[PDB]
Design a protein around this ligand. Structure first.
Ligand code: NA
Ligand code: NA
Lengths: 811, 822
């Protein structure tokens, strides 16, 4: 299926040789659609080789590219002379055959020859040649650059994508304010989508091998905003439709814009105007391949069957042809689905719908499977509705989309697949997976699934970047699948179990890995990578840290712990950084080409809809007078252990001329506590910790971690006592053996001081307090002792380099 | 702070819109001051873009004047007023910077720097440069000089006072392979010539130090190039030698002539040694150099065997006699040092003493902790005390040659101590190859100057001022946060000592520390890409690389630990972790390759080539960085099923892929969908166009024998009632007991009762959780088998949680429980 090589070879056609492209010939009996594709091919080749190939007016070159459509007299007298059999394109749908051939017609020696089964086959073939040459369908829509080549050669043999398994394959631009609309404003100057915009949309669709579009309908009217809209799609080869709730080829806004004049949307009071409304739409779309939405809602099963009948009679009257000859779609959404369980005319495409969240609701049984008109599926990657919007980023696991669409195809649904793509961006990858599956759902299985994004990343970022990029794409997709950014908040994950820490840290790890890849990019890929990997990863990693930080702020605040203050700072930074990321995306990235494409509000949802005016700061509490909020900690032992950071003491008594001092960051974990200054004696000085232990425990082992200070004042060493109030003390010398004497030097000395701490264990007795509360007092007996951590082991301590996670506390 | 970058009245014009102003040094000044001024000239050039003139005589309107207290010219400036002699007379290494009107004949107004001695004057000149934007680290760390249109000098008198420590210096040590091979590449010499030593010296004086122990592993400072001493001496730097290099001879001077000489044994070869000693003192005449007395044993070792206090006394008594013979003066007039390093401390303990005048150099443990400090009586020892501090070390229990590993807090907490106990004559820090200890050096030198500038409360303002100076005000706070934290992390354990067993794997501590460093990396990359391009090189040198190299090194070892744990269980997931080791190994090389070859244009090739992966013992005596041992499961795709879970903490969380046994229905397969769901993957019977009748999937677990009842949570993909109005059903149960059926999606539709209470809430989250209570059968095994049976097509099973009292509502349904397979 790969027919382009970038190095010369025998019995291969020199399309581009040593920087010189052969010309292009399109016979003039070819639809305007082919001439466009061919003009784009011409520019695509200019992109790859540097020199513009000439669009021939006649058969005036020895080697060239020819592209044509089956059924032409010219193509017939080429297929005939010769070799290419008729059966291979006769009555085939949207197929092409691409084949190097001598000697195609008199004035020519040899040519690469693309022949379509119909115009879209021919267009699809042209773009295949263009894509295998390195022009990604996303060269404009995602700034993917064109890998330059001095030599392009085409393999011998016959090359096809066959027939598309799904008859109509398209996208729906929807939920398009404010992002898409304000982008279109910035780019085109228009308060609607005009033909310049839709040319861009149609080309993407076609280059993706797609063939269908539901144009934007929230505030615009495709048919009525610009006479050239229809003319543009129809001449290029894109079939227009309208959404399930816009019957008879009228755009919903055509009615709304004139609500006051036309009156109610109700068939039992305003039938005549509505019939005329329907009628004018069917007239407007004559001579396009457009598909017609039937049915009606709002403002009995009998009433509806009668609307359809009338709609069909209106179709018959305008077309002067039986209804069955106008493509029609009827949607099974809401009540109309219940009704179905209802007389539906044989020829109509019956359109099923997903649950708005990527899971299919209902599929046809074997009896329904043989409904002549076929079945369609309406699938979502964006959504405005319950339980909360998903308007912001891509939230679709590659696996989900895959799993539900192979199911859909397998249950016979193969007439029409339409994907709600929001603002188009940032759904570039899921769009592509949708089109490729729509072409052939049986080209995929569990084994090879991830090859598709691998190809995608190879195509978007060069082969050397493909694997790493694909890994990041697949993961970020999966992470975003867990919870949308709109429904993410401080409660989504479990703080207590370290779940929230694990998912925050993991997303930041991915951010790290995406930045590695990003700075390793040849600069002409930086934009496409930011758009398709870097930004979604950065934006959501940052969001996750924000709510993580919000969660920590609340837990800590309720614990009267002033560490809440730092977590508040963090919330504010992430909130700032969120706006910072999108400003880069709108104004800086790609020269600000995509201004307004990333302005969707997502922080401040207290509801299903984005009712709130702007992105707003998530509630944070600050502890007043942190400097003075020290001491008072009480720990609650759990899982057989109490890990305590020196600083979280209950009460403390200093020696005269000393102040117990917090040395932040000191040691392996939180901080160090030390009597200061070091010149004064430590007599009478103590520091205490309040804990709850299960009652009955009478003997515990306590680990005391101190900075590995050496015997600097006195050859004996440093000593301290550790003990329970109401129990016997133990006095420990921790550094007497820590010196260069032969029996200490490599046995105990250096192995200790390299690792900067001294840990000693004490087997202490615990008094029988009736409420389980205990107080452990530590007394430094010599100067310059820095206490870092205590661990009360009562059966659960597990030897850990940082001496286990700090236990539950409050002040 | 006296330098502003915008004009104003009553201020002094130093740079007007790209125009500097001349400098004038009276030719009566030490050559070292001409050198400093020489550099100031080049600094201004860098600041605006035009080089100021070095005036022959006092002949200008607006110029800089620098000088030293005592010259006839200076006295005839200070009297021209209004400056008191007391301010500088008898003062040590102090300066006065005061704009003065009508300073002498020919000069209208001039910025005047007057030092109390030559070094004073120099530090004054370098204070001007530093304040103008010339960072001491402008060459040594590629720190840009912020371009300035205008530059002006506030009025009033300015000083740093006298320094609190007399001698403040560095020891270049453990200098191979990095420093050595870099010097080669840079200077073209296989030894340190005066050109290398000029750069070293300049840095020291700019940092406000004054002392140096030169590299001595394979070089000989004094012999290699006759200009070495002359440069240091003439620039203002005082030279000394290490604790095993007595009497002004570099140890290699002995090694090079070892056969010719005798053997480093004073009791049997006194004559040849006495002469060696003598030649050193002869040679350092005319210099401020400090002389090492005492004697260890021929390298980093003891003379000899065990403490011999009587003998070393003769060594000393004799050395001091040589000093007088050479100097024809009393010994007490030649600066001397006795260093109590390693074993030499038992000497002082066994009671050895030296004359009142020698500097008693006390020592840290080679790892940042001070060994001893004077008591009350001892602090009264007239020669004074000193401290030999380490930020790099070759020796026990393993080398630390690679990266900065000193937490900011440690250096500070130990040095505030040292100072409080009146150790205030000499501080020297072992800096390894100088790079990458740029930070700790500066903290050392700044503390050295003025230790009571620092307290626990404002400590962190020092690396802040550091980062501002190096990266620009707007990146200070963040850069400082990263500097502090990375220093701290590295304190936990050295690169050399870190290995797969450092952290606890089972508890998730390993995971924790690995993620935290990549978080840090992530944060530093952010800051990096946000920088104006002139700072990129510095920031890489000072922050980025230390962080990346280490974060990567932590991940390599974490992956190793995960690889072995998983390989033990026969879990093919071990292959992924294996790939991850090889990948981070390669990345370690890529990072140092960049540092050596790409960054700063390759200015620092070989400064970052230390071996750090593959230490078996204390020393780096192994061929090269070598890949940690990893294990692979052969035939991974066939290594499925067989899993047995063991409960803990009152739960068993099973990822669905990890089954014990399965049986498919006719013309279906049980199929793994990697990444499917919230966690690991999903199991589904495929294709979905077949009935699931007779299909099942089983899990083998170990509960405590006395658990009668459990609640199992079954998590499937939120598949909807697509085929059958009744919806989808499965059953879950123990072999030996009854199956329990569950209909998971009947309530998931648009009916009024369901639509907004349960339907949309559930589907937007892509999963369905249902719980069943189960009776635990009594088994002979103590083991139970729990069987899931899909009853409708298209059910994807994601996870199971067997809960016997420990389960905690979690979005990901808790970290998977402990397993092994076969
Ligand atoms: Na959007
Ligand atoms: Na080194």
């Amino acid at each position: 299926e790969q027919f382009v090589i970038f190095t010369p070879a025998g019995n291969h056609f020199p399309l581009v040789a040593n920087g010189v492209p052969c010309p292009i010939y399109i016979d003039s009996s070819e639809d305007k659609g082919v001439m466009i594709a061919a003009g784009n091919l011409q520019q695509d080749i200019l992109q790859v080789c540097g020199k513009k190939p000439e669009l021939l007016t006649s058969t005036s070159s020895k080697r060239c590219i020819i592209a044509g459509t089956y059924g032409t007299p010219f193509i017939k007298k080429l297929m005939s002379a010769g070799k290419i059999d008729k059966k291979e394109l006769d009555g085939k749908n949207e197929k092409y055959i691409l084949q190097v051939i001598a000697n195609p017609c008199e004035g020519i020696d040899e040519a690469v020859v693309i022949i379509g089964s119909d115009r879209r086959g021919t267009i699809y073939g042209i773009y295949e040649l263009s894509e295998q040459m390195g022009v990604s369908p996303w060269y404009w829509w995602a700034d993917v650059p064109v890998m330059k080549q001095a030599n392009v050669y085409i393999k011998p043999g016959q090359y096809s994508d066959g027939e598309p398994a799904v008859t109509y394959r398209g996208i729906f631009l929807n939920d398009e304010a404010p992002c898409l609309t304000r982008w279109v404003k910035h780019t085109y100057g228009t308060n609607y989508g005009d033909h310049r915009f839709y040319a861009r949309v149609c080309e993407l669709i076609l280059r993706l091998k797609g063939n269908f579009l539901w144009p934007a309908m929230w505030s615009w009217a495709f048919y009525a905003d610009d006479p050239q809209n229809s003319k543009t799609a129809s001449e290029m080869g894109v079939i227009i439709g309208t959404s399930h709730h816009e019957p008879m080829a009228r755009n919903h806004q055509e009615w709304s814009r004139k609500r006051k004049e036309y009156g109610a949307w109700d068939y039992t009071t305003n039938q005549k105007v509505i019939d005329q409304f329907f009628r004018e739409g069917i007239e407007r779309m004559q001579g396009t391949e457009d598909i017609v939405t039937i049915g009606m809602r709002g403002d009995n099963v009998k009433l509806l069957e009668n609307v359809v009948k009338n709609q069909r009679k209106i179709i018959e009257e305008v077309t002067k042809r039986p209804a069955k000859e106008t493509p029609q779609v009827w949607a099974l959404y809401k009540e109309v689905l219940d009704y179905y369980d209802m007389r539906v005319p044989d020829d109509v495409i019956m359109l099923l719908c997903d649950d708005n969240w990527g899971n299919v609701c209902r599929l046809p049984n074997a009896k329904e499977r043989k409904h002549p008109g076929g079945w369609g599926m309406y699938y979502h990657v964006d959504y405005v509705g319950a339980p909360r919007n998903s308007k912001w980023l891509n939230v679709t696991p590659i696996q989900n989309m895959w799993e539900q669409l192979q199911l859909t195809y397998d249950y016979g649904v193969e007439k029409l697949w339409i994907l709600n793509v929001g603002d188009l961006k940032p759904m570039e990858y899921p769009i592509t997976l949708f089109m490729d599956m729509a072409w052939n759902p049986k080209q995929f299985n569990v084994s090879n699934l991830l090859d598709h994004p691998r190809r995608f990343c190879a195509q978007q970022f060069g082969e050397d970047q493909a694997d790493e990029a694909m890994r990041i794409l697949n993961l970020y997709s999966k992470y975003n699948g867990r919870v949308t950014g709109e429904m993410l908040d401080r409660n989504t994950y479990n703080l207590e179990t370290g779940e929230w820490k694990q998912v925050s840290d993991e997303y930041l790890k991915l951010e790290a890995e995406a930045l590695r890849q990003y700075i390793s990019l040849k600069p002409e890929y930086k934009d496409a990578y930011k758009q398709l990997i870097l930004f979604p990863v950065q934006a959501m990693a940052n969001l996750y840290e924000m709510y993580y930080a919000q969660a920590m702020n609340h837990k800590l605040y309720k614990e009267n712990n002033p560490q809440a203050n730092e977590w508040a700072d963090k919330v504010e930074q992430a909130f700032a950084r969120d706006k910072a990321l999108s400003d880069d995306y709108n104004n800086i990235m790609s020269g600000g080409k995509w201004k307004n494409m990333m302005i969707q509000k997502h922080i401040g949802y207290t509801s299903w809809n984005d009712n709130f005016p702007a992105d707003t700061l998530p509630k944070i509490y600050r502890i007043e007078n942190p400097e003075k909020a020290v001491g008072g900690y009480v720990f609650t032992g759990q899982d057989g252990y109490i890990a305590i950071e020196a600083e979280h003491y209950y009460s403390a008594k200093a020696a005269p001329d000393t102040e117990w001092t917090v040395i932040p960051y000191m040691g392996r974990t939180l901080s160090g506590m030390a009597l200061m200054p070091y010149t004064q004696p430590t007599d009478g000085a103590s520091i205490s910790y309040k804990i709850k232990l299960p009652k009955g425990i009478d003997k515990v082992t306590v680990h005391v971690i101190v900075k590995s200070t050496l015997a600097f004042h006195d050859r004996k060493g440093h000593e301290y006592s550790i003990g329970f109030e109401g129990g016997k003390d133990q006095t420990i010398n921790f550094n007497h053996n820590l010196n260069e004497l032969p029996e200490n030097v490599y046995s105990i000395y250096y192995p200790t001081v390299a690792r900067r701490i001294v840990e000693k264990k004490a087997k202490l007795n615990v008094p029988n307090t009736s409420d389980g509360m205990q107080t452990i007092t530590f007394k430094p007996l010599d100067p310059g002792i820095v206490l870092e951590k205590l661990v009360v082991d009562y059966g659960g301590y597990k030897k850990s380099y940082l001496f286990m996670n700090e236990s539950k506390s409050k002040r």
